[PDB]
Amino acid sequence: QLEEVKQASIKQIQDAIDMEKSQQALVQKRHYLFDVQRNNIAMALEVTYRERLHRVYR
């Protein structure tokens, strides 16, 4: 009697927990990525201006 009830409880809260945790991640990671993606761009640009002043002046 006792077994099947406890098996369903375990599986039930599991699919809950995992689904909300999976959800929380996809937002945050991607907000993540957006940080970086702009960054990786914009970085090289300033620099190129920067070094270019070097290069041409020399």
Binding site: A16, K29, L33, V36
Partner: protein
């Protein structure tokens, strides 16, 4: 422009699966770190010229002076964009990320919680 302040949770970063980009993320991180190391170094300012010194001293002269005003006057564009669909290829995929999958995923989550209530009876 200056620096962009985006903080990157690298944990979350690679993981993504909009599947045309998960591979890209793994590469893009490292592509980043190449760019990251590069910029972080580059010396911020180059020097400029003692025009007066060379003004005297270059005697195919007026060259330094011509150059002086013209160099002090000569200005510079700032390097183009390519790929900034990211700002947008974000937020819409973000609605997929968050809201669309979120809400559905919470809808799932609740049924198990309600049913763990039931299983508490």
């Amino acid at each position: 422009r200056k620096l962009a302040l985006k903080t990157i949770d690298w944990v979350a970063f690679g993981e993504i699966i909009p599947r045309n980009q998960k591979a890209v993320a793994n590469s893009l991180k490292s592509w980043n770190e190449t760019l990251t190391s590069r910029l972080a170094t580059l010396p911020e300012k180059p020097p400029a010229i003692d025009w007066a010194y060379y003004k005297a001293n270059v005697a195919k002269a007026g060259l330094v002076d011509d150059f002086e005003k013209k160099f002090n006057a000569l200005k510079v564009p700032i390097p183009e964009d390519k790929y900034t669909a990211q700002v947008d290829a974000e937020e819409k995929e973000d609605v997929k990320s968050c809201a669309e999958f979120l809400t559905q995923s919470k809808t799932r989550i609740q049924e198990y919680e309600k049913e763990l209530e039931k299983m508490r009876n």
